[PDB]
Amino acid sequence: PHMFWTGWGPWERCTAQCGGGIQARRRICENGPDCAGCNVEYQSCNTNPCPELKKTTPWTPWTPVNISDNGGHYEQRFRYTCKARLADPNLLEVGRQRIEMRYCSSDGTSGCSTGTLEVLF
Amino acid sequence: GPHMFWTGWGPWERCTAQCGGGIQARRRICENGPDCAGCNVEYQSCNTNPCPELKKTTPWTPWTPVNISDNGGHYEQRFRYTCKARLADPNLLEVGRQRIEMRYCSSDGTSGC
Numbered sequence: 001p002h003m004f005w006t007g008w009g010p011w012e013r014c015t016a017q018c019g020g021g022i023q024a025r026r027r028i029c030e031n032g033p034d035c036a037g038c039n040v041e042y043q044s045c046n047t048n049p050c051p052e053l054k055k056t057t058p059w060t061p062w063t064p065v066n067i068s069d070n071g072g073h074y075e076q077r078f079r080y081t082c083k084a085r086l087a088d089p090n091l092l093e094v095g096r097q098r099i100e101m102r103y104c105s106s107d108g109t110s111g112c113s114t115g116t117l118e119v120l121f
Numbered sequence: 122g123p124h125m126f127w128t129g130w131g132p133w134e135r136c137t138a139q140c141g142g143g144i145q146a147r148r149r150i151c152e153n154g155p156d157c158a159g160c161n162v163e164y165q166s167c168n169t170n171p172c173p174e175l176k177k178t179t180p181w182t183p184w185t186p187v188n189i190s191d192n193g194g195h196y197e198q199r200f201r202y203t204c205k206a207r208l209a210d211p212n213l214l215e216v217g218r219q220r221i222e223m224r225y226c227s228s229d230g231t232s233g234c
């Protein structure tokens with residue numbers, strides 16, 4: 001009896017979800033053990049770039065943007081998005097909020113420009 | 122004829138990732154073949170330790186009053202955040218666009234202030 005290879009099996013699972021991985025398919029040498037050639041073959045898979053994953057920062061608190069409520073006032077809040085090219089959303093995180101505080105007075109020096117013109121009304 | 126044999130395995134080549142898991146190959150050559158028994162290449166995983174947390178800061182939000190000042194002065198505040206990702210390359214981490222919402226607060230309750 002001469003040695004022979006079984007037919008190639010299916011391509012198995014890819015090592016990466018995206019950004020490039022490899023996968024294998026296999027076969028068996030019968031009546032061997034030393035058939036010519038190799039019992040496993042590899043190819044690349046999922047070579048497309050990973051998608052952009054997004055996470056939003058918390059909103060800042062609603063605060064006035066005007067220092068007077070003459071007939072009402074406007075309020076605003078802000079937020080950003082954090083983005084990364086990843087396969088796992090657990091690897092992207094929004095870090096700790098930082099806050100700064102200053103006091104604005106009439107004859108002040110903290111560098112405020114908000115209600116300067118209100119004195120003229 | 123001439124004796125057919127495999128050269129010794131070369132060294133493992135460069136890992137496809139520096140962290141978070143990649144693959145690397147090593148190779149050998151069938152001499153006086155070409156039908157050597159076995160494989161001319163092998164692959165293994167490498168650099169499976171987690172990538173470091175790389176960080177980028179958002180821009181500061183605008184300085185805004187804390188509340189409507191009944192007295193002469195008022196406090197103002199602003200904020201910023203950090204974006205973090207486990208990566209080797211900081212270019213793959215980005216701070217996105219700033220979103221701004223605005224409402225008008227008056228005597229009625231039509232805007233939820």
Ligand SMILES: *[C@H]1O[C@H](CO)[C@@H](O)[C@H](O)[C@@H]1O
Pocket residue numbers: 003004005035036037156
């Ligand atoms: C299996 O590998 C190839 C066929 O795919 C040949 O060298 C031979 O048939 C071997 O048994």
Ligand SMILES: *[C@H]1O[C@H](CO)[C@@H](O)[C@H](O)[C@@H]1O
Pocket residue numbers: 006007008027
């Ligand atoms: C597997 O590889 C190809 C088929 O994809 C052929 O050379 C043969 O069928 C082998 O078993």
Ligand SMILES: *[C@H]1O[C@H](CO)[C@@H](O)[C@H](O)[C@@H]1O
Pocket residue numbers: 034125126127157158159160
């Ligand atoms: C090379 O591969 C193995 C040794 O590592 C054997 O099947 C044989 O020596 C071949 O030439």
Ligand SMILES: *[C@H]1O[C@H](CO)[C@@H](O)[C@H](O)[C@@H]1O
Pocket residue numbers: 128129130149
């Ligand atoms: C490479 O693989 C092992 C050594 O790592 C042995 O089977 C032989 O030295 C081959 O060339």
